[PDB]
Design an enzyme around this catalytic site. Structure first.
Site, short mmCIF file in Angstrom:
data_model
loop_
_atom_site.label_atom_id
_atom_site.label_comp_id
_atom_site.label_asym_id
_atom_site.label_seq_id
_atom_site.Cartn_x
_atom_site.Cartn_y
_atom_site.Cartn_z
N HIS A 89 -2.70 8.48 -3.31
CA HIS A 89 -1.37 9.07 -3.40
C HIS A 89 -0.33 8.27 -2.63
O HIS A 89 0.87 8.39 -2.90
CB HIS A 89 -1.37 10.55 -2.99
CG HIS A 89 -1.34 10.78 -1.51
ND1 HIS A 89 -2.45 11.13 -0.78
CD2 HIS A 89 -0.29 10.80 -0.65
CE1 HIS A 89 -2.10 11.30 0.48
NE2 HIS A 89 -0.80 11.11 0.59
N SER B 138 -1.93 10.38 6.14
CA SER B 138 -2.59 9.95 4.92
C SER B 138 -3.12 8.54 5.10
O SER B 138 -2.37 7.64 5.47
CB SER B 138 -1.58 9.96 3.77
OG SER B 138 -1.14 11.28 3.47
N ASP C 258 -8.96 10.52 -3.89
CA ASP C 258 -7.70 10.04 -3.33
C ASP C 258 -7.86 8.81 -2.43
O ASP C 258 -7.53 8.84 -1.25
CB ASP C 258 -7.02 11.18 -2.59
CG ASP C 258 -5.62 10.83 -2.16
OD1 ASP C 258 -4.99 10.01 -2.83
OD2 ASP C 258 -5.13 11.42 -1.18
#
Length: 243
Positions: free
Chosen positions: A73, A196, A121
């Site tokens: 992402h 992230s 992801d």
């Protein structure tokens, strides 16, 4: 499966250890800035800030001589364009306007946006060597790649990355506690979206997963951190694609 009110209450109280106070007021055991000397050593020196044009920056882990592992992402906002991404290993910007990049800032040669599948992801970023021909993994040993196979509910691990919303360009570590592993890596811990792509390490310094995001947990009104473990599939693809 209706989770009991008792279990929800236990979850709220544990989650509140990390979010019930200001992040600056968290105990250092749970969340702390990585100091200059610590940034120098393993595994902190494998952690970098992933800049994507038009986005707030996030985190990635050096896993091969020219390879950084981060989230799909995060990489997707480059739209497959390597000129839109840069990697800043151990960047530090203090609170008084001074940035250091001890290893320089690395340009990207190629983005592998979803080599693990769109529902996993993770993304691989392949770096150019520096202007003198020196790969980042020539300067720094890449992270040792472990496995998620031996992880268990209750395990404490170390999540290392760049919590942008808290402080910009400042590596921090967060202690995480694994929960319900039957659906992948879920864990209590303090994170923000810049985390992230953060590396999750065991006490042996082995990379066992990568932080992803928060997801609903127990019911639709509560949440937990989610990361992608270095499971059998992920490790196989890393070994196929790493360079």
């Amino acid at each position: 499966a209706e989770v009991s009110a008792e279990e929800i209450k236990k979850h709220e109280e544990k989650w509140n250890k990390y979010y019930g106070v200001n992040a600056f007021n968290l105990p250092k055991e749970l969340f702390s800035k990585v100091d200059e000397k610590d940034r120098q050593k393993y595994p902190y020196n494998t952690i970098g800030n992933v800049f994507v044009k038009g986005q707030t920056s996030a985190t990635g882990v050096l896993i091969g001589k020219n390879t950084v592992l981060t989230n799909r992402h995060i990489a997707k906002f480059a739209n497959g364009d390597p000129s839109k991404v840069s990697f800043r290993p151990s960047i530090n910007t203090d609170d008084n306007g001074n940035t250091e990049t001890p290893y320089g800032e690395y340009e990207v040669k190629e983005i592998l946006q979803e080599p693990f599948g769109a529902g996993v992801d993770l993304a691989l970023i392949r770096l150019k060597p520096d202007q003198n021909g020196v790969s980042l993994g020539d300067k720094i040993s890449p992270a040792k790649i472990g496995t998620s196979n031996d992880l268990k509910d209750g395990d404490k691990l170390e999540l290392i990355g760049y919590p942008f919303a808290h402080k910009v360009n400042q590596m921090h570590r967060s202690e995480i506690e694994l929960t319900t592993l039957s659906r992948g890596l879920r864990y209590y811990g303090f994170t923000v979206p810049g985390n992230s792509g953060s590396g999750i390490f065991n006490s042996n310094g082995e990379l066992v997963g990568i932080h992803s995001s928060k997801v609903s947990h127990l019911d639709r009104e509560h949440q937990i951190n989610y990361g992608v473990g270095i499971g059998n599939y992920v490790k196989r693809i890393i070994n196929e694609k790493n360079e």
